[PDB]
Design a protein around this ligand. Sequence first.
Ligand SMILES: O=C(O)COc1ccc2sc(CNc3nncc(-c4c(Cl)cccc4Cl)n3)nc2c1
Ligand SMILES: O=C(O)COc1ccc2sc(CNc3nncc(-c4c(Cl)cccc4Cl)n3)nc2c1
Ligand SMILES: [K+]
Ligand SMILES: [K+]
Lengths: 308, 308
Amino acid sequence: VVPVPREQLARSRVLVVGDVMLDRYWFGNVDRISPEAPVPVVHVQRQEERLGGAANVARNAVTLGGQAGLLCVVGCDEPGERIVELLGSSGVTPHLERDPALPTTIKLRVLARQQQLLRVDFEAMPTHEVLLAGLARFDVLLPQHDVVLMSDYAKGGLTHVTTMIEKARAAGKAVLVDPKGDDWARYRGASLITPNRAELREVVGQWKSEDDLRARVANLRAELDIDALLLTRSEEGMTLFSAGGELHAPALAREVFDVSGAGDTVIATVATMLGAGVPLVDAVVLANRAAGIVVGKLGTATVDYDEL
Amino acid sequence: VVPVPREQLARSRVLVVGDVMLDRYWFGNVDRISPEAPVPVVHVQRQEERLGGAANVARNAVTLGGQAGLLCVVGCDEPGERIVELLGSSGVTPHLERDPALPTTIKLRVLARQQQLLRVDFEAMPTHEVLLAGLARFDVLLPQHDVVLMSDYAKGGLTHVTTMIEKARAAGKAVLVDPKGDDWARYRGASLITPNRAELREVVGQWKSEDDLRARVANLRAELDIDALLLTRSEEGMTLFSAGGELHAPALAREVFDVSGAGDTVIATVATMLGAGVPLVDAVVLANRAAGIVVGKLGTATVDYDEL
Ligand SMILES: O=C(O)COc1ccc2sc(CNc3nncc(-c4c(Cl)cccc4Cl)n3)nc2c1
Ligand SMILES: O=C(O)COc1ccc2sc(CNc3nncc(-c4c(Cl)cccc4Cl)n3)nc2c1
Ligand SMILES: [K+]
Ligand SMILES: [K+]
């Protein structure tokens, strides 16, 4: 595949819609047991923070060169303000709906001796009032973007996916979906869906061989008005499923330092590439390289233009 | 003992010096295991908050009728602001030194199914610059109060106890000490110290009988220039140790709903009573009633005038 000009990518606008969350980590050391309970006492020494969820996908799109918008719901609190800060410095254009009764989604980790002890989640269901308000935003935001990326983490911000998809398709805009859950009936209409071997395992069912691979997946592309599926197989690489054939893209880089964030990087690349007017086949390759590279770096890591 | 007029108590000023901390609780429910670690996932549904440490002792003094000042160190953060809020609405006069490099002391509990899972502490050692600044405050605050209460929780805010005590004694002010630790050499000069049966057990050593009780404790009152010791024995009640005799004060109320906060209530009462010009023997009794009553209520609970 031929490289893509820096001016082309700079024109690429991606509308990322889904669930944003703040990844927070508490590194401390335990030396004693609580006087009131048979539980350890973590004396926190350090906190690390990073954008997670749909925010991470939008972050990857920017570094590659393209522009990125982020439609999502955030609470009226400190974590909400932190996401706003992190977004502004990451170059992502925020389009946030505020729900004071909603806690900003947080996945907090508590660690000691380089291992986890407990995970703490702050999250709730966004009100119908807020969901429709954001849907109104989507109508205004849709014509301003080249391609739409649905980032689902099942936190509630993607209740109206079916309608959002149908709108973007009606405008000739492609719809990409990073899924979550065993039920994908909500995702009908999508241009492309991007599951793992495991994400697809517990929905299409357990299977046999690579010829039977097409046998089930092509049926799934029929069950739901879904044009293509990109199956990320780690070791084996990944395979696109068009209606006019297939494509394989195995491993590329040679570092398995950290897997986290690889999936988010993949779908973010395809979106940004498509927005710049790049063929789907070529876009899949660029997502594979981006994937391969970020594995040689810690969690939320990003491939920029020069690395491609 | 004869009751004490509401006007008398209203005149009583108590200077509480020590470690303040925010007691925070996270009530949630766990339903799954973290995908990245063999640890539970707590989805928090509720947070409860209350003043802890020296702040709680100062809170008890106010409700009884007396005035209360609180000299302590607090960080420049959200928890710090919360303590300031809680203090203002609790009627306690704040005298706070701010250390931006110091986290406001927090003891966070994480609960599920009505039981603890983990305890999380945020705390650090106050700088020498901050400690001396607060000591300068103490010099200004000492002449404005009737009696001084040292509330130690070994968080660092009581590094200069020995000097503070010597100053208050030199002004004819009584010094009360709620201790913490096996080493009490810092507490020399004190008018009164208030340990548990357990708090004294691991410092005076294990012992035999009630006559041997005086044998060791009277030696301790000699080792350190300490006039009196108030030994809280729960079931057996409590016993004051003057140089001119002893006194016993057994159980009074008939509810053991919750023990937490009972000790803080005891020493806070003696201080406030002494400040109003009440004999030490009488002050000990009023602390026993206050103790007995608060046991019939949840943790940080307070006896006001009418209950005495
Ligand atoms: O399991 C998950 O939760 C995410 O699953 C993913 C995410 C991203 C990708 S990108 C991909 C194809 N490209 C590629 N290139 N170099 C290295 C790897 C790789 C990874 Cl990434 C993990 C383990 C082993 C390898 Cl060899 N993969 N497969 C996935 C699967
Ligand atoms: O163990 C601790 O950490 C604190 O230790 C304390 C704190 C406060 C007091 S006040 C006291 C004498 N008065 C009194 N009156 N009614 C009930 C009780 C009581 C308590 Cl409070 C707990 C358990 C059993 C009883 Cl019968 N006690 N002994 C202590 C000891
Ligand atoms: K990574
Ligand atoms: K209590």
